[PDB]
Amino acid sequence: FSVEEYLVHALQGSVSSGQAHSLTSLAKTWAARTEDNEGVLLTEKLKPVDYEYREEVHWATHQLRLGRGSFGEVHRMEDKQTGFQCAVKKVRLEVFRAEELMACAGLTSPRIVPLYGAVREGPWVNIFMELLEGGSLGQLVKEQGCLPEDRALYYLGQALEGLEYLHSRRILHGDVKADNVLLSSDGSHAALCDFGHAVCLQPDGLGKSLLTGDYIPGTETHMAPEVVLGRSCDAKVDVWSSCCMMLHMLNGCHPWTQFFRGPLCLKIASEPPPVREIPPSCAPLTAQAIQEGLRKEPIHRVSAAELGGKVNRALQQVGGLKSPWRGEYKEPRHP
Ligand SMILES: COCCOc1cnc(N)nc1-c1c[nH]c2ccc(C#CC(C)(C)O)cc12
Backbone angles phi, psi at 105, to 5 degrees: -65, 120
Experimentally, how was this structure solved?
Answer: X-ray
Q: How far is CA 163 from the centre of its chain?
A: 9
Is the distance from the beta carbon of residue 89 to the nearest atom of ligand 1 less than 6 Å?
A: yes
Angle between helix 304-317 and 236-251 (nearest 10): 30
Domain boundary among 103, 131, 159: 131
In a shared domain, residues 121 and 141: no
> What is the C-alpha separation between 152 and 248, in angstroms, rounded?
9
Query: Which is catalytic among the residues 150, 175, 194, 234?
Result: 175
In a shared domain, residues 209 and 313: yes
Of all protein residues, the one whose alpha carbon is nearest to atom 19 of ligand 1 is 194
**CB-hemisphere CA count at 13 Å for 200?**
11
Domain of residue 154: give its range: 132-335
Give the chain's domain count: 2
- Amino acid identity at 321: L
> For the domain that residue 290 is a member of, what is the CATH number?
1.10.510.10
In a shared domain, residues 196 and 77: no
Domain boundary among 116, 131, 146: 131
Resolution in A: 2.9
Distance 173 CA to ligand 1 centre (A): 14
In a shared domain, residues 303 and 320: yes
Burial of 305 (0-12, 13-18, 19+ CB in 10 A): middle
Q: Binding residue per annotation — 72?
A: yes
> What is the C-alpha separation between 251 and 332, in angstroms, rounded?
6
For CA atoms 202, 205, 206, 209, the dihedral sign is negative
Is the distance from the beta carbon of residue 102 to the nearest atom of ligand 1 less than 6 Å?
A: no
Q: Binding residue per annotation — 184?
A: no
Task: Write the DSSP string, 168-222.
Answer: HTTEE-S--SGGGEEE-TTS--EEE--GGG-EE--SS-----SSSSSPPP--GGG
Instruction: For the sheet with 181-183, list strands across it.
Output: 135-136, 181-183, 190-192
Is 36 catalytic? The answer is no
Distance 79 CA to ligand 1 centre (A): 18
In a shared domain, residues 279 and 292: yes
> What is the C-alpha separation between 335 and 332, in angstroms, rounded?
10
> What is the C-alpha separation between 138 and 178, in angstroms, rounded?
4
Question: In sequence order, which ranges of the chain are alpha helices (DSSP H)?
Answer: 3-11, 20-32, 99-102, 137-144, 149-168, 225-228, 236-251, 264-270, 284-293, 304-317
Q: Which helix (H) or strand (E) holds 78?
A: strand 74-79
By three-state DSSP, how is residue 266 classified? helix
The closest of 186, 154, 192, 156 to 174, measured between CA atoms, is: 192
Of all protein residues, the one whose alpha carbon is nearest to atom 17 of ligand 1 is 69
Backbone angles phi, psi at 314, to 5 degrees: -65, -25
Angle between helix 284-293 and 304-317 (nearest 10): 170
Angle between helix 236-251 and 284-293 (nearest 10): 140
Q: Binding residue per annotation — 119?
A: no
In a shared domain, residues 174 and 313: yes
Burial of 254 (0-12, 13-18, 19+ CB in 10 A): buried
> For the domain that residue 89 is a member of, what is the CATH number?
3.30.200.20
Is the distance from the beta carbon of residue 129 to the nearest atom of ligand 1 less than 6 Å?
A: yes
- Amino acid identity at 9: H
Distance 73 CA to ligand 1 centre (A): 9
Enumerate the β-bridge partners of residue 120: 38, 125
